[PDB]
Amino acid sequence: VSASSRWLEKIRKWYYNAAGFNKLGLMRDDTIHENDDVKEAIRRLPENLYDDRVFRIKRALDLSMRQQILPKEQWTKYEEDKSYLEPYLKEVIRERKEREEWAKK
Amino acid sequence: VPPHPQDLEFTRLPNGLVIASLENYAPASRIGLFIKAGSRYENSNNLGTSHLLRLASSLTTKGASSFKITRGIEAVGGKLSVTSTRENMAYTVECLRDDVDILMEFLLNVTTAPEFRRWEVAALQPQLRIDKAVALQNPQAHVIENLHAAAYRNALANSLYCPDYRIGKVTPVELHDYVQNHFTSARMALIGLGVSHPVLKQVAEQFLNIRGGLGLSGAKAKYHGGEIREQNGDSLVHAALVAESAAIGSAEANAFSVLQHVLGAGPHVKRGSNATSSLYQAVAKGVHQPFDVSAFNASYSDSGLFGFYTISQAASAGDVIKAAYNQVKTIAQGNLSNPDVQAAKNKLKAGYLMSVESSEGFLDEVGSQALAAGSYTPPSTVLQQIDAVADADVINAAKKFVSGRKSMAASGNLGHTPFIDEL
Amino acid sequence: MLTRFLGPRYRQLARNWVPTAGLWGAVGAVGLVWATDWRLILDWVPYINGKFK
Amino acid sequence: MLSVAARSGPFAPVLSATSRGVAGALRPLVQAAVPATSESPVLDLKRSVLCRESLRG
């Protein structure tokens, strides 16, 4: 049992479905606003992941144009949502903050 | 009255690691981790790995980021240097006495916890092309690369600079691999100047207990011979002629080192006819234009190359070489006086002593001694070693060069440069 | 977004630039006072008395 | 007497954080620049000449 922590998770699953990037085949990290830290982390991704990212965005911008979504079966499931960028961006912010700390002394 | 000088502390740990320290009461401090990891341990599948590695010394570690290594060392005004040779890599670290701790920590991270990040390695690859271009602007660098590629079929054939076809091809995994199997206890020495023995022994016991790689200092140099020729255009001709000699540490090598001073190393007097240099006098006799000639002496763990090196005009190349070569021949034939050797002894002895008088040259010698020998041999007995070389040994060294299967590299307009064949 | 700008260097950087930032304010004040003819400020100036009644 | 600098001959490269890169041992030169017309490869996409952490009071 973890009754609260699965309703606090079920709101999230609800929100995710309401956000609807998954309708356009997208993953959460595909929708992030590209600032310097993000642009850096996109830069640091390995070939396979970067290539997969570009395709998703192309397919998303394609549908967004024809004003469509994917069939239901082919949407991104909340569970199957690979948070592939987070560790890269975590490292870039961690690096930046060390700079910002060194700039203080 | 100066201070009565301290003595060097030495320790082999059971694991094979070596610690040597000297409290010289200097205002600064120097620590060198010396590793049997030079170019020779590269193979035909990973050439240039130890070059990029040498270039990688301030990339990110566990425990210290790239930016920290730089700003941290710069904040205290110290240095982090890395010197590769065909046999060793040597990570050196300098600072004021009060700051040994932070630099030590950095040292340990660079050498034992390097992370080699994909994108950081990617960004550093082009430094190989600049690094190589800046060295290769001395005609001597390519000559000595080529001299080695031709001498050995093997490990010492590898150059300290990365082959062009490898630039941007060295993988993050190749460096991880190089470190895990070369930067190990039994292949290592931790030398400290202006540090204490307990502290070095402590960090050695705590941080440098690594073992899980190769064993042999002799993966084994198979000397072969032959020549490499590089047409250049280039103002004047560079040529090195060489035979297999003697492994560093052996008695024979000391005879070769004396031979080198009988014939002639670098000059002693600013702008001089180099009167005692028997090689210089020999060429000068029948060459009346700009030239240079020196005895070349390279000593390694399991082989050696002795001979001479020449710089001359394109058309004089063959005359300069043949004259130098015949001069060696006369010493092999027996034509060598006692005072001739006595002067070479004095030139060598003095030169050695001067070579260790600063802390940079001292630390490097104690480091290379720790790896090649597993010992510290004081100057007092090195001079005794040199003294034991008789005239007959120096003759025997010249006899070995003359009669031994040659190796030759040369670059310039090679039109009038001979071919071993014709020597 | 502002916590990055607080530390000893910025304390020195502010102090280093304050005699200057104060003197530019004196420039702006005298400059505004002179340009609009602020007889409110200028009545109390020992030579500029163009309001000579 | 074990060091490829103390047996002045074979090559040694040096890299650093703050200091310029060095090369080699001996090898002619110095007694090759007295017999003149040796201008040397000078500056064609190249490092600092001399090296400077030798600053004084």
PDB file of N, CA, C and O in Angstrom, chain A residues 43-46 91 95 98-99 102, chain B residues 65 67-68 71-72 75 117-119:
ATOM      1  N   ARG A  43      23.196  19.459 -26.830  1.00  0.00           N
ATOM      2  CA  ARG A  43      24.511  19.332 -27.439  1.00  0.00           C
ATOM      3  C   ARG A  43      25.253  18.121 -26.944  1.00  0.00           C
ATOM      4  O   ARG A  43      25.901  17.425 -27.747  1.00  0.00           O
ATOM      5  N   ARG A  44      25.145  17.857 -25.631  1.00  0.00           N
ATOM      6  CA  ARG A  44      25.821  16.734 -24.992  1.00  0.00           C
ATOM      7  C   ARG A  44      25.192  15.368 -25.208  1.00  0.00           C
ATOM      8  O   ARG A  44      25.775  14.374 -24.800  1.00  0.00           O
ATOM      9  N   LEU A  45      23.999  15.297 -25.810  1.00  0.00           N
ATOM     10  CA  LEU A  45      23.319  13.972 -25.981  1.00  0.00           C
ATOM     11  C   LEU A  45      24.098  13.088 -26.975  1.00  0.00           C
ATOM     12  O   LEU A  45      24.801  13.613 -27.849  1.00  0.00           O
ATOM     13  N   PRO A  46      24.084  11.765 -26.762  1.00  0.00           N
ATOM     14  CA  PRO A  46      24.772  10.855 -27.689  1.00  0.00           C
ATOM     15  C   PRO A  46      23.984  10.751 -28.995  1.00  0.00           C
ATOM     16  O   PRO A  46      22.805  11.133 -29.030  1.00  0.00           O
ATOM     17  N   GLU A  91      23.601  18.151 -14.876  1.00  0.00           N
ATOM     18  CA  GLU A  91      25.060  18.283 -14.867  1.00  0.00           C
ATOM     19  C   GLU A  91      25.528  19.660 -15.319  1.00  0.00           C
ATOM     20  O   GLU A  91      26.478  20.194 -14.761  1.00  0.00           O
ATOM     21  N   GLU A  95      27.303  22.494 -13.075  1.00  0.00           N
ATOM     22  CA  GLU A  95      28.542  23.079 -13.589  1.00  0.00           C
ATOM     23  C   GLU A  95      28.461  24.599 -13.571  1.00  0.00           C
ATOM     24  O   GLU A  95      29.393  25.266 -13.092  1.00  0.00           O
ATOM     25  N   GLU A  98      28.672  26.117  -9.971  1.00  0.00           N
ATOM     26  CA  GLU A  98      30.054  26.141  -9.528  1.00  0.00           C
ATOM     27  C   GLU A  98      30.762  27.413 -10.069  1.00  0.00           C
ATOM     28  O   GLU A  98      31.515  28.084  -9.320  1.00  0.00           O
ATOM     29  N   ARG A  99      30.459  27.774 -11.328  1.00  0.00           N
ATOM     30  CA  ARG A  99      30.994  29.005 -11.922  1.00  0.00           C
ATOM     31  C   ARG A  99      30.472  30.201 -11.141  1.00  0.00           C
ATOM     32  O   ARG A  99      31.255  30.929 -10.523  1.00  0.00           O
ATOM     33  N   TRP A 102      32.133  30.448  -7.862  1.00  0.00           N
ATOM     34  CA  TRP A 102      33.513  30.912  -7.981  1.00  0.00           C
ATOM     35  C   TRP A 102      33.581  32.421  -8.263  1.00  0.00           C
ATOM     36  O   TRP A 102      34.378  33.138  -7.642  1.00  0.00           O
TER      37      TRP A 102
ATOM     38  N   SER B  65      35.903  19.136 -10.830  1.00  0.00           N
ATOM     39  CA  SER B  65      35.508  19.482 -12.208  1.00  0.00           C
ATOM     40  C   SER B  65      36.666  20.132 -12.935  1.00  0.00           C
ATOM     41  O   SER B  65      37.623  20.627 -12.291  1.00  0.00           O
ATOM     42  N   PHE B  67      36.729  22.989 -14.540  1.00  0.00           N
ATOM     43  CA  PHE B  67      36.792  24.368 -14.084  1.00  0.00           C
ATOM     44  C   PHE B  67      37.511  24.526 -12.711  1.00  0.00           C
ATOM     45  O   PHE B  67      38.275  25.467 -12.522  1.00  0.00           O
ATOM     46  N   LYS B  68      37.264  23.594 -11.778  1.00  0.00           N
ATOM     47  CA  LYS B  68      37.957  23.587 -10.483  1.00  0.00           C
ATOM     48  C   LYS B  68      39.454  23.333 -10.597  1.00  0.00           C
ATOM     49  O   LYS B  68      40.238  24.040  -9.968  1.00  0.00           O
ATOM     50  N   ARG B  71      40.876  26.757 -12.142  1.00  0.00           N
ATOM     51  CA  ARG B  71      40.740  27.863 -11.202  1.00  0.00           C
ATOM     52  C   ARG B  71      41.353  27.593  -9.826  1.00  0.00           C
ATOM     53  O   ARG B  71      41.864  28.521  -9.178  1.00  0.00           O
ATOM     54  N   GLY B  72      41.313  26.328  -9.394  1.00  0.00           N
ATOM     55  CA  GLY B  72      41.877  25.938  -8.129  1.00  0.00           C
ATOM     56  C   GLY B  72      43.369  26.053  -8.112  1.00  0.00           C
ATOM     57  O   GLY B  72      43.918  26.603  -7.181  1.00  0.00           O
ATOM     58  N   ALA B  75      44.346  29.810  -8.708  1.00  0.00           N
ATOM     59  CA  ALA B  75      44.110  30.605  -7.467  1.00  0.00           C
ATOM     60  C   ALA B  75      45.301  30.663  -6.534  1.00  0.00           C
ATOM     61  O   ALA B  75      45.563  31.711  -5.942  1.00  0.00           O
ATOM     62  N   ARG B 117      34.929  12.442 -20.189  1.00  0.00           N
ATOM     63  CA  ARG B 117      33.583  12.648 -20.722  1.00  0.00           C
ATOM     64  C   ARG B 117      33.552  12.787 -22.259  1.00  0.00           C
ATOM     65  O   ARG B 117      34.400  13.457 -22.853  1.00  0.00           O
ATOM     66  N   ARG B 118      32.614  12.065 -22.873  1.00  0.00           N
ATOM     67  CA  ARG B 118      32.391  12.007 -24.310  1.00  0.00           C
ATOM     68  C   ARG B 118      32.614  13.342 -25.018  1.00  0.00           C
ATOM     69  O   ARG B 118      33.562  13.468 -25.822  1.00  0.00           O
ATOM     70  N   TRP B 119      31.903  14.379 -24.557  1.00  0.00           N
ATOM     71  CA  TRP B 119      31.926  15.715 -25.195  1.00  0.00           C
ATOM     72  C   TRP B 119      33.204  16.517 -24.905  1.00  0.00           C
ATOM     73  O   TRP B 119      33.568  17.433 -25.686  1.00  0.00           O
TER      74      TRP B 119
END
